[PDB]
Structure formats: structure tokens, C-alpha cells
Structure 1
Amino acid sequence: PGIVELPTLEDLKVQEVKVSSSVLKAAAHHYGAQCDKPNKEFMLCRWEEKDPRRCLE
């Protein structure tokens, strides 16, 4: 019953954050304090859309 539309590999190319979990945990509080707006926008998009293919940007 139809096909599943998946994004291409080049649509999933992004600069990755390659620090370990301890580094993230050390700066978790300041990360939440400073980068709150894009994180909240992405989380809102993820919840309303309910689809990983609609919140890639």
C-alpha cells in the first residue's frame, strides 16, 4: 500500500558534535541556558509533526 518516502543520504549530512558524554554533561547546564531557542523549536517541531522527516532543518 504505497511506498515510504525516505530522505537521501546527502540530506542527512551535518556537522556532528563529536564530544563524549562526560563533556556534554559538564557543559549541559550552560548548553541549556544558551542554546535554548533552537532546541525548543526543534522539540516543538518533533512533537507536533510526529515525523523525523519533517524536522531535519
Structure 2
Amino acid sequence: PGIVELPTLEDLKVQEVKVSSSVLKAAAHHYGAQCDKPNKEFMLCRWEEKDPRRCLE
């Protein structure tokens, strides 16, 4: 019924955020204040495409 296409492991590489949940929770309010635009663009892409493969960038 067709072949499922998946991104290569190189495509999925990124500089990860390796801070723990307490650090994230402490920073969360200012983080949502400052980094709103990329987060909202990603969430709109996510909820409009319904496909994780189309919103990697």
C-alpha cells in the first residue's frame, strides 16, 4: 500500500537543549515571553500539517 518515507538520521540532528525540567520551569515565563515567534510558527505548522516530517526546520 505504499512506502512510508522517513527523514535520514542526519536530517534529525540538532543542537539539543540539555537543561533539566527545573531549569526549564524556572525560565518558562520569560522563555515564552521572548521566544514566542518561532514557537508559535512551529505550533501552527504542526497543527496545520498534521505531520511531524513537514515541520522539522
Q: Distance in 2 between matches of 1:52 and 1:37?
A: 19
Q: Distance in 2 between matches of 1:2 and 1:48?
A: 23
Normalized against structure 1, the TM-score is what? 0.99
Deviations 1:4-29 (A, max 9, x none): 00000000000000000000000000
Percent sequence identity over aligned pairs: 100
Q: Distance in 2 between matches of 1:30 and 1:14?
A: 23
**How much does 1:34 deviate?**
0.1
Which portions of structure 1, spanning 4 or more consecutive aligned residues, are displaced by more than 2 angstroms? none
CA RMSD, 1 decimal: 0.2
Identify unmatched segments of 5+ residues in structure 1.
Answer: none
Q: Distance in 1 between matches of 2:21 and 2:36?
A: 19
Normalized against structure 2, the TM-score is what? 0.99
Q: Distance in 2 between matches of 1:20 and 1:45?
A: 26
Identify unmatched segments of 5+ residues in structure 2.
Answer: none
Give the aligned length: 57
Q: Which residue of 1 aligns with 2:13?
A: 13
